[PDB]
Amino acid sequence: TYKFVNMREPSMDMKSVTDRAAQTLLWTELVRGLGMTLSYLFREPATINYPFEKGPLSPRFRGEHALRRYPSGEERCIACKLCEAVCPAQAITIEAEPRADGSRRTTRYDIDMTKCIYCGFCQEACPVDAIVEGPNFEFSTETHEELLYNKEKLLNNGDKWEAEIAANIQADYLYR
Amino acid sequence: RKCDPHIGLLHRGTEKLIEYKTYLQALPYFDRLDYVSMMCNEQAYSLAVEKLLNIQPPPRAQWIRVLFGEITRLLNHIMAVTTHALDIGAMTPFFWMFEEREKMFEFYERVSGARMHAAYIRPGGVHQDLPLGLLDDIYEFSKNFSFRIDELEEMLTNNRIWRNRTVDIGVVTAEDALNYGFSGVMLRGSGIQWDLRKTQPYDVYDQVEFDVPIGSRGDCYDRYLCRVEEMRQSLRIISQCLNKMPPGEIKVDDAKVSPPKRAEMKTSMESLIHHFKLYTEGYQVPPGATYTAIEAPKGEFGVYLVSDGSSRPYRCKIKAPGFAHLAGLDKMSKGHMLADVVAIIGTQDIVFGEVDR
Amino acid sequence: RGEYVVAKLDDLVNWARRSSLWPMTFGLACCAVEMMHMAAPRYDMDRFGVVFRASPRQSDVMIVAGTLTNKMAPALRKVYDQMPEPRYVVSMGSCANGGGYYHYSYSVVRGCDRIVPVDIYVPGCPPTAEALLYGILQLQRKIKREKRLRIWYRR
Amino acid sequence: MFMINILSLIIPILLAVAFLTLVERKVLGYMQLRKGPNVVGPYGLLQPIADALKLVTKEPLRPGTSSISMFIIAPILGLSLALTMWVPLPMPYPLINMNLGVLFMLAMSSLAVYSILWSGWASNSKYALIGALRAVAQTISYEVTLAIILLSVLLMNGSYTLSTLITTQEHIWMIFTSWPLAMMWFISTLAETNRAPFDLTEGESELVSGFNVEYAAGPFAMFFMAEYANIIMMNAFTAILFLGASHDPHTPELYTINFVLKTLALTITFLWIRASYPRFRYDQLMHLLWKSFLPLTLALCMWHISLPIMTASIPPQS
Amino acid sequence: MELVQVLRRGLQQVSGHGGLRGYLRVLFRANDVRVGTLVGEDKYGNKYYEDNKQFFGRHRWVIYTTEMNGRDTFWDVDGSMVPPEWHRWLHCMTDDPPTTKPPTARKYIWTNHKFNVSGTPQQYVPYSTTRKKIQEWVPPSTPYK
Amino acid sequence: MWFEILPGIAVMAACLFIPGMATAHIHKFTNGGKEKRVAHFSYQWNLMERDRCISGVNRYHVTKGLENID
Amino acid sequence: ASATRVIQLLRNWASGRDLQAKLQLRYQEISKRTQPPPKLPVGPSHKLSNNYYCT
Ligand SMILES: CCCCCCCCCCCCCCCCCC(=O)OC[C@H](COP(=O)([O-])OCC[N+](C)(C)C)OC(=O)CCCCCCCCCCCCCCCCC
Ligand code: SF4
Ligand code: SF4
Ligand code: SF4
């Protein structure tokens, strides 16, 4: 199927010519352009004021990373290493040694925050969903160094943004 | 008389970086390939990859694939006309309709979790399922959308000074456009009868009714009416697809190419091993080459990826719609004023992120 | 005394500076489209007394966004030097911040900071319009905590 | 006692000109569904002061290739003529009662082009010089239409004395007698002041800065204040020839507010017009004038010059 | 007739703002003169509001506390000051204010949410958290053979 | 809503109101209550010289009616 | 959306088109941000029998 979009024969009667002659002379299609501008002026603006209000998001939002931990308190990060093999920017970096007890927790988990793209792949990669992307997106900075994250900063994000992502994953794991 | 540009201001690794990544890691490349229409690129790459694996997606996954593919089709034509409005001098239109783009962007956030770079279309079907109520949100927006595009229509089409600045201002004849690699809308506005949607009905496209907007002589105005008509037709493709959503699945039931469900991941070993290997090296694609193109909302978007029988691609040259359509600029601007060049670009779609392959 | 006088004058000047930040948005890639969502009817950019301005001669903050290739590099520095005092550059997105996912590419300079003294680093890929607006608010407060007249007074 | 009136005239324009930028930015915002500046003070009212002195406290770079003398002269004469332009306005009692005031209005309107020309040439930039001669050729081309339309309009007034306009336009607005020339006059005004759709002299996305080019805190603010000084007044000229109000001598305040409101509403349309319409191309911008306006302009002048003799309604010049 | 109740809302705005002083406070500090129902109040002073009639995005809003974690804030409105539990409801990610449903109790959750600390002494600085490699030699202590 | 525009034009109109109001009131004040008599032609000028000469105080806007004549 | 009827007529007449019933931005029609838990189906090969990968 197809549909012509431009072809059209203008009517050639005196009324039609007068219509077109009036249109060029007494600008009517021009005034129509002005006509619905006023309708836009006398309308509610959609201006969300910030930080007072917030454009809606979803329980699946991907933002600042935050390494979580078990309800007992122990780190979820198993050093399973899979997040690297999927990280398409190779932002993360995992190296682990046997702990004092023996349970391996990474001695270095440094997401280069100005490297990743917030894939959601690292979340989809973790078999114990240790690394998540917190709903926070307002974490700008002034020195390039503060962007460069580490294991401790990740853990602090997990402990700071803990209730939200625990709730978000609780309401979103069924889709996953 | 002569107009050859110089690009590379956004030339990037793309194909060069792709070879050192796996297919799944190569998916974000296409999302960021062009910076305007994201979802439709993953349409091409996933289609090409699933073609190499001889795995067809579940029927439902195709239906979301087309639904969001045409939602992004709605995204693309909005900016091309309104940026043409920004060029041509009409600042009001691009503010009005662009508020509507925030609604589809909100839809993108609800499904994928990212506002623009969804990374949603994956080989073997879409990654995740729609949230409960996303379909309703589409209908609420779509109900009022034609009302918004009419607001664009009234002030940006019959405006006497929009018309003259878009009529007769640059035109390409039939064989000239055909032989310049022009494709998709660019030929359709010049009168050529061709459309990837119908002639080569990729995905579930052979079950939805729509009308391609072929036009007159083929100047800036001609394709302009073609583009807005595409949005109206895209609205029906949305509407047909909105009440056709079947009770199916989102991913292929082949764990060797699709990550297993997280619930079964932490329970069954075959899921764990398959998730492990798929997330370490990924699926191995059988060797060969394939150029598969889809109708981009800008032109003909094709990826000619060649498989080395490994878990990674070998070379993934892209048919960039911006590329081939920038190739025509020299003949496209034979005999026109300097102030026309920006509008000469405007009738086309040259996103500097996409032209560079 | 004189210290109070210069402090009030310092307050007045920075009040203007943290109000009329006419930006050079120099974005090149998908970081550029999401910035318009901050010039949006949804989140107004003009509502904080700042209007997207051409003619880099009259501009204060340069919003750099998108991936930065070597070819663009000579052109980015020349416009930065053409920018008048005061001039602040806000690096938007992973690509412009440190190179981002286009890091190891042969034709990408890792981060805009290697070419220009970035003042605000806005992370994101893309940085959501709210996030980049927050960075602008962060830069606005940075102008507030400025002591130009104090340093000259106490030189 | 007189420097009173000069200052009581000048400073209000600068304040009115400055708040037009707010009014423009906010009107456009609501025009294209936005709110505009509203966070710098109540409803952004303090924003004009914020940006203005900001445009006085930011460093004024002098281009190396720029000639300093002309780069300083062009804003000076562009600003100076605009301020002197306001002195013969027949606002209740005009400050300057020049019997040839309308000629005085046009004489100064023909010198703003020098502010356009020199600033374009002084900047000594390829982008400036093509912006300059194009800009000057546009505005002096609309001079002939601007001059003739008036000649038709005041031909029924009696002379070029601006205060006489209130006497002629007493029972009805003069638009009801020359409305073919009304939009013809009004449309030509945006051409002269270079406002969209006739905004070829700025072109933020085409000419980047137009005739303003490399102008910043200092000379730029004068140009921005100059351009937003002419916009405020071409209303007053329009609100004097065309729609006016009674001037009961016992209450001159009655003429003030009535005149002020018309000069306010028309300025909104000027701002409103920029919102919707696309921006002209140069060829058409000259084509519309020389070919679609000039033959119309000449014919109406013949009609308006034979109508009073036809109907024995010649106006008294005294 | 339709004009009077609109002005009635305008005058009711001052009534709901606790007098003229409260009206000018919100008009300057928040630049949003609107009366909404008190949904909840967190542990810092952040007062949250909701209004069904307002459209999506202005459905829920908040006027921040004047003081939290030391930083005096009256003209220092920021988006990083929202505690995590209210970060859900405020962004409209879930129609469930924390005052109704409180977060699941855990020992390790921060008791005091922190604002954006960048640009201040307590900001962040990256560092290598690995231990060391290549252990060096050590001789007894008297030099040259 | 749209009424937030009105404060923007409020200080517009009031400020634009004053130059007309002023240049009338000092005109009233300078010319002894009445307005500034305007001489568009020589008649209305050499008129005022008669009034200025006849006032005795060298002020045109001073009137001398029937009480002046003998 | 909340404007009085008279001003609604003004924008209605200036546009000539029913902007009230199809006003642009969202209102109390969207799906609640809280939603019932989903129960996503099983795939086209989630059969415990006669389902060898070779087939
Ligand atoms: C007894 C009666 C004697 C007199 C009778 C006179 C004839 C009847 C009346 C004829 C119409 C009036 C005179 C002509 C006016 C138009 C001139 C013209 O060339 O127009 C066509 C021209 C040219 O149109 P065109 O170019 O498409 O076609 C003309 C013919 N060619 C192609 C050969 C050139 O177009 C315009 O003027 C369009 C508008 C340009 C300006 C853009 C902004 C418009 C803003 C409009 C809203 C504001 C209005 C404010 C009004 C005043 C308020 C105080
Ligand atoms: S974060 Fe998860 S996937 Fe990454 S190393 Fe730790 S346990 Fe493995
Ligand atoms: S979400 Fe970011 S950190 Fe995680 S794998 Fe993807 S790019 Fe890397
Ligand atoms: S940082 Fe991310 S969003 Fe921005 S240009 Fe680079 S890839 Fe695109």
Short mmCIF file of N, CA and C and ligand atoms in Angstrom, two decimals, chain A residues 65 83 87-88 92 111 116-122 133, ligand 3:
data_model
loop_
_atom_site.label_atom_id
_atom_site.label_comp_id
_atom_site.label_asym_id
_atom_site.label_seq_id
_atom_site.Cartn_x
_atom_site.Cartn_y
_atom_site.Cartn_z
N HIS A 65 26.64 3.04 40.94
CA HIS A 65 26.82 1.66 41.37
C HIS A 65 26.93 1.59 42.89
N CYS A 83 31.45 -10.15 35.95
CA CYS A 83 31.09 -8.79 35.56
C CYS A 83 32.13 -8.19 34.62
N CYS A 87 31.54 -6.66 31.02
CA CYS A 87 31.68 -5.21 31.00
C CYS A 87 32.25 -4.75 29.67
N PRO A 88 31.43 -4.13 28.82
CA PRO A 88 31.88 -3.84 27.46
C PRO A 88 32.79 -2.64 27.38
N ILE A 92 35.17 -2.07 35.20
CA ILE A 92 35.39 -2.68 36.50
C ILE A 92 36.78 -3.31 36.54
N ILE A 111 35.28 0.22 39.98
CA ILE A 111 34.53 0.62 38.79
C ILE A 111 35.04 2.00 38.38
N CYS A 116 32.35 3.18 32.43
CA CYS A 116 31.18 2.36 32.17
C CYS A 116 30.11 3.13 31.42
N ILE A 117 29.09 2.43 30.92
CA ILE A 117 27.95 3.06 30.28
C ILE A 117 26.66 2.79 31.02
N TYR A 118 26.74 2.27 32.25
CA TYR A 118 25.55 1.88 33.00
C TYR A 118 24.74 0.86 32.20
N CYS A 119 25.41 -0.23 31.82
CA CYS A 119 24.79 -1.19 30.92
C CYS A 119 23.56 -1.82 31.55
N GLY A 120 23.65 -2.17 32.82
CA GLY A 120 22.81 -3.21 33.36
C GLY A 120 23.36 -4.59 33.11
N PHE A 121 24.37 -4.72 32.24
CA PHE A 121 24.99 -6.01 32.02
C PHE A 121 25.68 -6.53 33.28
N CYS A 122 26.41 -5.66 33.99
CA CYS A 122 27.08 -6.10 35.21
C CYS A 122 26.08 -6.60 36.23
N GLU A 133 23.10 -1.00 40.23
CA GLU A 133 23.15 0.40 39.84
C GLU A 133 22.07 1.15 40.60
S1 SF4 H 3 26.68 -1.59 33.97
FE1 SF4 H 3 28.54 -0.29 33.78
S2 SF4 H 3 30.01 -1.20 35.26
FE2 SF4 H 3 28.38 -2.75 34.95
S3 SF4 H 3 29.18 -4.07 33.28
FE3 SF4 H 3 27.91 -2.48 32.27
S4 SF4 H 3 29.39 -0.84 31.74
FE4 SF4 H 3 30.44 -2.18 33.25
#
